[PDB]
Amino acid sequence: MEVLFEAKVGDITLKLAQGDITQYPAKAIVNAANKRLEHGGGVAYAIAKACAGDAGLYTEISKKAMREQFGRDYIDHGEVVVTPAMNLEERGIKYVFHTVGPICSGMWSEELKEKLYKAFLGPLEKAEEMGVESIAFPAVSAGIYGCDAEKVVETSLEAVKNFKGSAVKEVAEVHGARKSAEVALKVFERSL
């Protein structure tokens, strides 16, 4: 874990970090999931496997939590399913917050932006609701969903700036790859 940027946004200490989100010191980590919470690849897989020892197992656990919480087997952008972090709890990570961003395939529009915005904002609001004081998120939609990396980080920062909460004191945005992190750094530097 390398911290690349740290800024004060209101009462929130916001950090940009490069590393493995399943090792970030936060109370809740966010999973960039699909609507059905099938954690078959990407950071969704790494989180699923790190929590349960088997990604398929966490998928099942996630679908069950989703049914209980939303009464159906999918979520919409902005809805956040909460699962126990299990094997990560020893590291101080209590929860995984599952969020779903839009599929972009290199496209960008106001409707896609709004969907991505809800996907970042939902988990912050979920943390505030639960009184969860620190949260880490990944680059939602910037994986196989193909959203432009700079648009993703810009949208994330809008959600952080507009978020109204007092319980949330610490927010981190975590990128796995050095390149991805350095692009976020450019956005962070000009926007804060």
Q: Please give the CATH topology (third level) of the domain spanning 1-192.
A: Leucine Aminopeptidase, subunit E; domain 1 (3.40.220)
CA quadruple 78, 82, 85, 89: dihedral positive or negative? Answer: positive
Resolution in A: 2.1
Separation CA 138–CA 132 (nearest Å): 17
- Residue 118 vs residues 56, 124, 129, 162: alpha-carbon distances, Å: 27, 10, 16, 11
DSSP 145-161: T---HHHHHHHHHHHHH
Separation CA 165–CA 39 (nearest Å): 30
Please answer whether residues 134 and 96 qualify as being in contact, where contact means their C-beta atoms are separated by less than 8 angstroms. no
DSSP secondary structure code for residue 64 in this structure: H
Please answer whether residues 32 and 143 qualify as being in contact, where contact means their C-beta atoms are separated by less than 8 angstroms. yes
**Which method, experimentally, gave rise to this model?**
X-ray
Please answer whether residues 135 and 170 qualify as being in contact, where contact means their C-beta atoms are separated by less than 8 angstroms. yes
Q: In the structure encoding, which two tokens stand for residue 36, read together?
A: 């059905």
Strands 2-9 and 12-18 turn out to be antiparallel
Separation CA 136–CA 56 (nearest Å): 23
DSSP secondary structure code for residue 23 in this structure: G
CA triple 117-119-123, angle to 5 deg = 115
Q: Taking the CA of residue 49 as centre, how many other CA atoms within 13 Å lie in the half-sphere pointing to its CB?
A: 7
Backbone angles phi, psi at 15, to 5 degrees: -125, 145
> Residue 105, Cα to own-chain centre: how many angstroms?
19
DSSP 70-127: HSSS---TT--EEEE-GGGGGGT--EEEEEEPPP-TT---HHHHHHHHHHHHHHHHHH
User: For the stretch 22-38, what's the b/e string if a residue is b when 16 or more beta carbons lie within 10 angstroms of its beta carbon?
Assistant: bebebbbbbbbbbeebb
Number of H helices and E strands in the chain, helices first, is: 5, 7
